[PDB]
Amino acid sequence: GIGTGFPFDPHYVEVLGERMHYVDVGPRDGTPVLFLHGNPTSSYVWRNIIPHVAPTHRCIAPDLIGMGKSDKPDLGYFFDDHVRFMDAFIEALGLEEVVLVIHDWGSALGFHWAKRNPERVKGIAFMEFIRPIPTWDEWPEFARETFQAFRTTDVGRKLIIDQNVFIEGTLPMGVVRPLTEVEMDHYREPFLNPVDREPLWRFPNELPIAGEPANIVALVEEYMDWLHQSPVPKLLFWGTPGVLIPPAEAARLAKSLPNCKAVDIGPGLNLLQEDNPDLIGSEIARWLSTLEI
Ligand SMILES: [Cl-]
Known part of the structure; x- marks a missing residue:
């Protein structure tokens, strides 16, 4: 069955005065593979994928600021805050060239960083990623x-901050298979106090849906423009019916984005890692072996 444990030794680094936690496993040399989670997860979402990649490549999986085991400064937790912290995390670890493996808001961070630093990105593996949703009719009914x-x-703060709905409800409705109590407890752990749920509510308020917020729409449109032109190697995982990326969108993108291979993981909603980690991990490892890294 799918592993529930999180065996990774903790690492911490100071980033803009705050401590960030990260997973760091695999061989020291080579090009590192940087795994970026989204909402409302942490590096825990990668726990069953990293073991397929760590035999042959360094795997680095940070917890976003205010999430996982990272510190919880009193911020708005806008996308811009996450950008500043992730930029400085990358520099604090002295990373030069990387491969990205990204999901959900981690994908907005990774595509935005890659568009700004294309010489340092040797490949992107992505899944259930942030794209502009043109109208509410393109959000799943x-x-x-x-x-x-x-x-x-x-209402939104009542649900997400007071009642913890993003953890108790949205997270299970983003996974096809049932999550176990131990898994739910790993996801609950960073958010036991309601005041710490700020990032969980700011993130859906930042999603580029029906033109709002205009600044995030513009930023995401720009990295999608880049992705449609750039020769960076691309690996897209998708599932049925998906959430952010429906199967037809995925098929489109696989042919439209240059140098892109698509992998069907089977049934999936948003956290594809929880529905088929072994396929995702093994396919990332295979794909890495084809890159000039
Ligand atoms: Cl979100």
């Missing part, structure tokens, strides 16, 4: 009213 309610300061 089964989740539409709740995401609309999340994007308010009254």
Whole structure:
């Protein structure tokens, strides 16, 4: 069965005055593979994928600021805050060239960093990634009213901050197979106190949906423009029915994005890592062996 444990030795680095935790396993030389999680997860979401890659490549998986075992400064936790912290995390570890493996808000961070630093990105593996959602009709109907309610300061904060719905509800509805109590407890751990749930509510308020927020839409459109032109090697995982990336969108992208290979993981919603970690891990490892790294 799918592993529930998190055996990785903790590492911490100081980044803009705050401590960030990260996983760091695998051989010291070579090009490192940088795994970036999204909302409402942490490096825990990569626990069953990293073991396929760590035999042959260094795997670095940070916890975003305010998440996982990272510190919880009093921020708004805008996407811009995550950009500043991830930029400085990357520099604090002295990373030069990397391969990215990215998901959800980690994908916005990784594509935005790669577009700004294309010489330092040797490949991107991505899944269930942030793209502009043109209208609410392109958000999955089964989740539409709740995401609309999340994007308010009254109902949305009641649900996500007071009641922890992003953890208790949205996270299971983003995984096809059932999550076990131990897994739920690993995801709950950083957010036991309601005040620490700020990032969980700011993230859905930052999603580029129906033109809002305009600044995030523009930034995401720009990295998608880059992705459609850049020769960077690309590996796209997708599932059925997906959430951010429906199967037809994935098929489009695989042919449209240069140097892109698509992998169907089977049934999946948003956290594809929880529905088929062994395929995702093994395919990343295989794909890495084809890159000039
Ligand atoms: Cl979100």
